[PDB]
Amino acid sequence: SGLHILAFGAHADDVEIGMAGTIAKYTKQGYEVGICDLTEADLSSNGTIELRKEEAKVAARIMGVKTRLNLAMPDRGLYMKEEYIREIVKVIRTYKPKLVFAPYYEDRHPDHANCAKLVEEAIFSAGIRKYMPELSPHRVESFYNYMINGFHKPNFCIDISEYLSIKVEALEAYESQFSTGSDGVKTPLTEGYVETVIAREKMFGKEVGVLYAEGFMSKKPVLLHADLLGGC
């Protein structure tokens, strides 16, 4: 039928950092969300690709994500390439996502911007019939950006107060990334990173009058219907 949400990350844990709470919130309401990791994060200082993929599976189940893909594009190699756009178009056209999410570009990790750029190009081409005509076109309704590193004034927020614990659980599934363990090394991700993610969501929460909120960017104004006065 088609995914309600397809969220792209450069590396498994990107989507979790940006929007694990939102995903958990909406999968619980019965919406179908998929995650597509562009790379296997082979250059990550800690862990292995297989371990990372296993953690991605654990995280997916925590978030109620039934569909998780890895396009196996090179870590630190998300250049603006036709072949990569093609691969993402294939994903978009296969899963027909109503909404697509990708990282926000203003991020210390260039892969995140590069992922967003590829996804943006792919979203546009996905709706073009004559492009890759072997697959039926799909028009994504909206493209939004979640935040990985740092913070920005969000265009919109999703209240994740009831789902923060699940987000932390989803994040903690990436043991290799955010914890040293027995043979791991100290990285920015190991040293108070998950705490920083919680902090951001607390900060965004306060902005909108809730305990924890995830913040999102949108190139277009968000369309309000039921959320203006509530009632759903």
Q: Which residues are annotated as a binding site for Zn(2+)?
A: 11, 14, 112
User: Minimum CB separation from a second copy for residue 118, in Å?
Assistant: 11
User: Minimum CB separation from a second copy for residue 36, in Å?
Assistant: 18
Q: Going by C-beta distance under 8 Å and a sequence separation of 6 or more, which residues neighbour residue 160?
A: 21, 22, 24, 25, 167, 201, 205, 212, 213, 214
Q: How far is CA 101 from CA 44, 59, 194, 216, in A?
A: 23, 17, 21, 9
- Decide which of Zn ion, a second copy, none touches 61; Cβ closer than 5 to 8 Å per partner kind: none
User: Minimum CB separation from a second copy for residue 175, in Å?
Assistant: 18
Whole-number Å distance between alpha carbons of 229 and 215? 20
Judged by CB under 8 A, the residue of 1, 50, 82, 134 near a second copy is 82
Across the strands, what pairs with 63?
none
With CA atoms as reference, report the closest residue to 220 among 123, 149, 138. Answer: 123
Does residue 52 bind Zn ion (CB under 5 A)?
no
- Decide which of Zn ion, a second copy, none touches 67; Cβ closer than 5 to 8 Å per partner kind: none
Q: Are 145 and 115 in contact (CB under 8 A)?
A: no
Whole-number Å distance between alpha carbons of 210 and 161? 7
Interface with a second copy by CB under 8 A: which range of 52-60, 165-173, 175-183, 195-203?
A: 195-203
Does residue 14 bind Zn ion (CB under 5 A)?
yes
Judged by CB under 5 A, the residue of 4, 5, 7, 11 near Zn ion is 11
Whole-number Å distance between alpha carbons of 189 and 193? 5
Nearest residue (CB) to a second copy, 61 versus 222: 222
Helix (H, G, I), strand (E, B) or coil at 77: coil
Q: Are 182 and 115 in contact (CB under 8 A)?
A: no
Structure tokens at 161: 């107060």
Interface of this chain with a second copy, residues 201 to 230, rule: CB under 8 A: 202-211, 213, 215, 219-230
Nearest residue (CB) to a second copy, 167 versus 200: 200
Does residue 80 bind a second copy (CB under 8 A)?
yes
- Decide which of Zn ion, a second copy, none touches 90; Cβ closer than 5 to 8 Å per partner kind: none
Question: Rule CB under 5 A: which residues touch Zn ion?
Answer: 10-11, 14
